[PDB]
A paper describes a structure:
S is the major surface glycoprotein on the SARS-CoV-2 virion and is involved in viral attachment to target cells via the interaction of cell-surface-expressed angiotensin-converting enzyme 2 (ACE2) with the receptor binding site, at the tip of the receptor binding domain (RBD), in the S1 fragment of S (Lan et al., 2020). Following attachment, cleavage of S releases S1, allowing a major conformational change in S2, exposing a hydrophobic loop that executes fusion of viral and host cell membranes, releasing the viral genome to initiate viral replication (Walls et al., 2017). In-depth structure-and-function analyses of 27 potent RBD-binding mAbs isolated from vaccinated volunteers following breakthrough Omicron-BA.1 infection reveals that they are focused in two main clusters within the RBD, with potent right-shoulder antibodies showing increased prevalence. In summary, we have presented a structure-function analysis of potent human antibodies induced by Omicron BA.1 breakthrough infection in SARS-CoV-2 vaccinated individuals.
Omi-3 and -18 are representative of IGHV3-53 and IGHV3-66 antibodies that bind at the back of the neck and account for 9/28 of the most potent antibodies. They show how these antibodies can be adapted to broadly neutralize all major SARS-CoV-2 variants. A problem for many IGHV3-53/66 antibodies is that most VoC harbor mutation N501Y, which introduces a steric clash with the LC CDR1 (L1) abrogating binding. However, we have previously reported two mechanisms for avoiding this clash (Dejnirattisai et al., 2021b; Liu et al., 2021b), by (1) mitigating the contact by inserting a Pro into the L1 loop or (2) shifting the L1 loop away from N501Y (Dejnirattisai et al., 2021b; Liu et al., 2021b). Omi-3 achieves resilience by repositioning the L1 loop in a mechanism similar to (2), whilst Omi-18 shortened the L1 loop, which becomes flexible enough to accommodate mutations at residues 501 and 505. Most early pandemic examples show reductions or loss of activity on 501Y containing VoCs, and we find that the appropriate length of H3 and L3 together with other changes in H3 can place L1 to accommodate 501Y and other mutations present in the Omicron lineage.
Author numbering:
A (entry chain E): 333 to 527
B (entry chain L): 1 to 214
C (entry chain B): 1 to 215
D (entry chain H): 1 to 136, 142 to 222
E (entry chain A): 1 to 133, 139 to 219
Write the structure that this text describes.
Amino acid sequence: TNLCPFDEVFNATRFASVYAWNRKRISNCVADYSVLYNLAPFFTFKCYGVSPTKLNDLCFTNVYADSFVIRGDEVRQIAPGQTGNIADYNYKLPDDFTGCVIAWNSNKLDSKVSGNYNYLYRLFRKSNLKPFERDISTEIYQAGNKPCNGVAGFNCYFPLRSYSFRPTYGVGHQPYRVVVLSFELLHAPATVCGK
Amino acid sequence: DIQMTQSPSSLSASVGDRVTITCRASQSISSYLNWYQQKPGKAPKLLIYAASSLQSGVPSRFSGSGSGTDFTLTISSLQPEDFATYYCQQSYSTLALTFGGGTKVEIKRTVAAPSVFIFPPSDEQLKSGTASVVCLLNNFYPREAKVQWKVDNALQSGNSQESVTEQDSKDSTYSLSSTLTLSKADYEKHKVYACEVTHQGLSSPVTKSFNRGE
Amino acid sequence: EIVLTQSPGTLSLSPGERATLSCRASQSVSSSYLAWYQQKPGQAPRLLIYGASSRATGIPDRFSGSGSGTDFTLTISRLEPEDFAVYYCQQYGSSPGYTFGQGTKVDIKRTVAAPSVFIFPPSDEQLKSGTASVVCLLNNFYPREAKVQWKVDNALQSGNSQESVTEQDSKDSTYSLSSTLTLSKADYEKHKVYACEVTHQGLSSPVTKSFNRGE
Amino acid sequence: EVQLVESGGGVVQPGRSLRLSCAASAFTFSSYDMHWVRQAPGKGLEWVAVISYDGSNKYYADSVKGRFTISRDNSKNTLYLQMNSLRAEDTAVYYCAKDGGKLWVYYFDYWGQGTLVTVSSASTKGPSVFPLAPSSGTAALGCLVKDYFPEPVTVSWNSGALTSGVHTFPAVLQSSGLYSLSSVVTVPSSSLGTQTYICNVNHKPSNTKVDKKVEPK
Amino acid sequence: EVQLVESGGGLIQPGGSLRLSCAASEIIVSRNYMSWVRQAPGKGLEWVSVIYSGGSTFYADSVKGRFTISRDNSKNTLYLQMNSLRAEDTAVYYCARDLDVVGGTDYWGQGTLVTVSSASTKGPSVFPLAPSSGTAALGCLVKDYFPEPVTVSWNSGALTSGVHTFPAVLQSSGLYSLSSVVTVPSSSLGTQTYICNVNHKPSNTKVDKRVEPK
């Protein structure tokens, strides 16, 4: 009677950057849906392809728990069929995404007075990300005609930037911790059931 | 949220026709599209769920197709009890269920030009400090009509309201009343009051006017 | 969205003085999301500073920026006559796209300069078309205020001319005015002396440049 | 054969509270999800809230979040909706809908007749009836029922004897928070000098009945 | 050698279409944030659209549904298709590469003018201004043309110092009129020849005119 490790994902002390988003593979457990069952109004809760009141009555093959950090103006992109720097270059959700997204304002946790430059994001990429693609490459992005060869220069920039979360910023520039729960049902034994 | 767009907003058809209503979603909603009928003053009724599945009790003349963003409700043979509004509703974002603008299937008939009437404010109301000028458009088809107010040949804007009736149960026409509300002071400061009606059944815009005190 | 508001609207300073151009955002954004642009007349804007404080490549040392939150500043020390332009601040924190500021116009003062008055009769290639355009030219003067009075046989011409002033020059910071007196070919021969009176602060007395038709 | 019957709707001042009910019949109530969907006068449908079959799960739309509270009593087969801090925009007909349950997502297969909830800071006011005199083959004359609250009003002509050519228009909500409508009738111009036209206006909320005689000026 | 050369502006009737180009050199359009910024005559700057290296497009609320930004990697050219143009769309349109936090918007195009009007394009008329009796002055007169702008240079751009090209004036005849002058030393009058180069892209009229004393 193992319980699905959801506390380890929501109650984590440190979250990942959006470009290197962390994923916890949860399987063969009993799902105590309660972290999402009754969520307060100050929680952004959007489910796609599945109803939350029905999750206790469904068994899935695997459930994926993706967690990372973005700013408030970018949470609208963590959704199926969305475009933008986060959706295209950091964390993309498919068009037929089956699962829920959870986001809450973490300005009291991830924002320092002198700036919290620890959280990063990808600004430049040659093409868009496929759904559930994770690109941790830090190769100098070529924006011009001459090859970079690992040289930061004109039309040759480092593809990652910092967020600089300061508490005195607006709500759209404050850090939001996002947890994306994917519910997968493939030709396999269903093991993640509810109770 | 996800925006559902329904075209057309209103269509005219007669009994026996084949009516097809369109429904577009701003993003792919898989096959989770639903169709609802609602008569005036009554509750909405479910027709099609999951894009195409027919709800029990609903006649077989209703059907749905489409997947992704484009969806289509089809009535093979329109019946008299099928003249109503039809809403499409997406259920992909289960925590953000959104409906469409609806399509009103009206009874089609020949074009009928409106009978324009204009009424000055009564002397009784003028003793209370308010003037109400009424412009009547009587028994026209279709519902589309433009009503402009002119006071001393000066176009009015922001002081009038319209009201339209449902399709008449005998000739399937509409009637509209536009109410221009002025203070008694502003009413006495002008002479020529007119409303200009633009309709399809009119060769030119018809203007009905009156002169205050005549 | 985010609204950007600059101040002041117009700033007139002597060469060598210090300018201070303000800019503020409706929401408290990071200092790294602001940028300043200079647009001289007839040109596209060029980047001066990005990230509020970092100077672009090839921009002189006298252009410096500072500020964070909702209080950003552009300082132009050692103002030069080639700094005559409109300066915009922009923000790219409300992605996608950016939002520009209302713009601060920077005029440049100098010493009074008298205009050089030239007058041009209408060309023969033009008189064959039916119109006759007399042109008077005021070249390189300061300040902008200069009255042009057309005298046709010592009769003041009203409702018959159109003036045109240029932007401040990038080197001498003067203006130039072009008054054009258009009148028909038939009415061009009814009169004889076509003059051009010029009154300016740099003239101890109004200066008139005229000519005679056929001389 | 599935029945849903609402109650509890009425007139309420802004910022006050109101509670709705929804009696379920002829189906296993305690095993289906339940929804609330509202519809403003003349507008489309808007989903409000959902509660699980056992009532342990509650979810709300962003326009009613933290302001409404949905609950259910499976021993009484009734669905509830506690509405606090009511705004003027909450003015709508509130339907309770049963979840179809066959799909992984939500869809409403049966609705209640609906109950009206009007939010306004205007007190009950009787209507003032002013005549619409005919112009001095067919003529038009009517009555103007102006400034009343709340809805509805009933207008007859000649105590019901005259129903042909009568068009009673829907009430419009003026900028003063008071309703106003017009009722008209078209008659032959020959009967203007030989027939008395009386409109019978009735407003039960304020208990105000006004008979007005329309005559040419 | 970093250029952003624009082309394709001119006069277009209201409700018509026009397509702007942004030829790029040494900068690859398909691997950069490329935007279109417009500036109404006498107003500030307005961002219109952007395209990402991944292909994502975004438009401002003032051009949504009417503009379409595209590109062609083989030609390395950014495009902007404009449909349903009106009076407000008259502006000087710029393309520019966006660097966001890592450099703002460094390189800009020279900008092409889009005039939306219901008037005919009339070619200019260039008339000389011969000098009369310390230094001397002469120039050309670019009269009766529509619409803006006209580019005037002297000796194919070889004569920069001393030239004053005046702004156009809207005369009563609906057309424009523009004066361009240059002060030159009186000594090099007969030995140095002066020619003004007047170009009118909307009417496709290029005229070179000789100026010499009577």
